[PDB]
Design a binder for these strands. Sequence first.
DNA 1: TATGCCCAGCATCGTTAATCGATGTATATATCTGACACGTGCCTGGAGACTAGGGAGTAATCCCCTTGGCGGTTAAAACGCGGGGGACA
Length: 51
Amino acid sequence: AKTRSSRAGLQFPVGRVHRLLRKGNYAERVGAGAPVYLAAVLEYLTAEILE
DNA sequence: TATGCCCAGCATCGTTAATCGATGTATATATCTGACACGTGCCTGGAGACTAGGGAGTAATCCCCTTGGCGGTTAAAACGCGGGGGACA
């Protein structure tokens, strides 16, 4: 698969959330599966609420 | 001439049948709006690939801090008793 989201099996945007973690000054280095983890998390929450 | 008798004459009641119209019920067609999927076009904000560097991992040593044990006084917790004054109706 090309799309990252799909390599991690998800609907949430892997790379759009990565950049948002660099345009928010939150820190000097951005982690590699953080982004995903985080995307996926919210994903659940949304669901949880949206369910 | 007046009084019972013959011959029409429309409205009284009821019943039958045809007709215009309303109500109920399909049945295939022509709008209405609200789309969600696709292709149109374009931006680049992500992906992809490579590099370089310094953070963070780990490992090896140190030594400070935290836990422990103990026993003596000495205040504190514990108890009760009693009755007043605040809660509650």
